[PDB]
Protein backbone atom coordinates (compact mmCIF):
# COMPACT_ATOMS: atom_id res chain seq x y z
CA UNK A 1 0.00 0.00 0.00
CA UNK A 2 0.62 3.63 -0.23
CA UNK A 3 0.68 5.45 3.27
CA UNK A 4 -2.28 7.88 2.78
CA UNK A 5 -4.32 4.52 1.43
CA UNK A 6 -2.73 1.88 3.98
CA UNK A 7 -4.05 -1.77 4.05
CA UNK A 8 -5.18 -4.01 7.52
CA UNK A 9 -5.12 -7.56 7.75
CA UNK A 10 -7.22 -8.89 10.47
CA UNK A 11 -5.82 -11.79 12.61
CA UNK A 12 -8.45 -13.89 14.17
CA UNK A 13 -9.31 -17.48 15.24
CA UNK A 14 -5.76 -18.91 15.27
CA UNK A 15 -2.51 -19.61 16.85
CA UNK A 16 1.06 -18.45 15.88
CA UNK A 17 4.65 -17.80 17.05
CA UNK A 18 6.13 -14.27 17.66
CA UNK A 19 9.35 -15.02 18.59
CA UNK A 20 10.35 -16.67 14.78
CA UNK A 21 9.26 -12.75 14.07
CA UNK A 22 11.45 -10.66 15.97
CA UNK A 23 14.32 -12.89 15.59
CA UNK A 24 14.19 -12.48 12.01
CA UNK A 25 16.88 -10.35 9.90
CA UNK A 26 14.70 -9.21 7.75
CA UNK A 27 13.17 -6.91 10.43
CA UNK A 28 14.97 -3.34 9.56
CA UNK A 29 12.52 -2.13 13.05
CA UNK A 30 10.81 -3.95 15.66
CA UNK A 31 9.64 -1.58 17.89
CA UNK A 32 6.71 -2.24 20.82
CA UNK A 33 4.60 -0.68 22.43
CA UNK A 34 2.16 -2.12 26.17
CA UNK A 35 3.95 -5.54 25.47
CA UNK A 36 7.40 -6.81 25.07
CA UNK A 37 8.61 -8.87 22.21
CA UNK A 38 9.51 -11.36 25.07
CA UNK A 39 6.62 -11.57 26.41
CA UNK A 40 4.13 -11.71 23.12
CA UNK A 41 4.38 -16.04 23.34
CA UNK A 42 2.58 -16.06 26.86
CA UNK A 43 -0.71 -14.49 25.60
CA UNK A 44 -3.73 -14.37 23.61
CA UNK A 45 -5.65 -11.50 22.07
CA UNK A 46 -9.36 -10.55 21.45
CA UNK A 47 -7.77 -9.91 18.05
CA UNK A 48 -4.46 -8.70 16.35
CA UNK A 49 -4.43 -6.31 12.93
CA UNK A 50 -1.23 -5.75 11.34
CA UNK B 1 35.06 -10.84 28.52
CA UNK B 2 36.20 -10.83 24.86
CA UNK B 3 34.66 -12.54 21.75
CA UNK B 4 33.79 -11.37 18.69
CA UNK B 5 30.40 -11.04 16.87
CA UNK B 6 28.33 -9.54 13.93
CA UNK B 7 27.48 -5.94 13.81
CA UNK B 8 23.84 -6.25 14.66
CA UNK B 9 23.89 -8.55 17.41
CA UNK B 10 25.88 -5.94 19.37
CA UNK B 11 22.55 -4.18 20.61
CA UNK B 12 21.92 -7.99 22.16
CA UNK B 13 25.09 -7.48 24.45
CA UNK B 14 23.01 -5.70 27.47
CA UNK B 15 21.39 -6.68 30.67
CA UNK B 16 17.50 -7.41 29.71
CA UNK B 17 18.19 -8.52 26.32
CA UNK B 18 17.65 -11.45 24.17
CA UNK B 19 18.12 -13.14 20.89
CA UNK B 20 20.68 -15.96 19.71
CA UNK B 21 23.89 -14.49 21.51
CA UNK B 22 22.14 -13.38 24.56
CA UNK B 23 19.61 -16.14 24.40
CA UNK B 24 22.31 -19.61 24.17
CA UNK B 25 26.12 -17.73 23.95
CA UNK B 26 26.53 -14.97 25.99
CA UNK B 27 23.88 -13.72 28.62
CA UNK B 28 24.45 -11.29 31.13
CA UNK B 29 23.30 -10.83 34.86
CA UNK B 30 20.03 -8.67 34.38
CA UNK B 31 21.88 -6.48 37.17
CA UNK B 32 24.81 -5.89 35.68
CA UNK B 33 27.74 -3.40 36.78
CA UNK B 34 31.01 -2.94 34.73
CA UNK B 35 31.06 -1.78 30.47
CA UNK B 36 30.51 -3.43 27.38
CA UNK B 37 32.93 -1.77 24.58
CA UNK B 38 32.89 -2.70 21.33
CA UNK B 39 34.32 -1.96 17.68
CA UNK B 40 33.72 -2.66 13.75
CA UNK B 41 36.76 -5.26 13.05
CA UNK B 42 36.23 -6.12 9.62
CA UNK B 43 39.33 -4.92 8.12
CA UNK B 44 41.28 -7.36 10.77
CA UNK B 45 38.60 -10.26 11.16
CA UNK B 46 37.01 -11.14 7.44
CA UNK B 47 38.68 -13.25 5.42
CA UNK B 48 38.67 -13.78 1.78
CA UNK B 49 36.09 -16.14 0.50
Partial sequence: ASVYAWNRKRISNCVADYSVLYNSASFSTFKCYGVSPTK???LCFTNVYA | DSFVIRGDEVRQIA????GNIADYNYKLPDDFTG???AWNSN?????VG
Fill in chain 2, 15 to 18: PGQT
Fill in chain 2, 35 to 37: CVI
Fill in chain 2, 43 to 47: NLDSK
Fill in chain 1, 40 to 42: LND
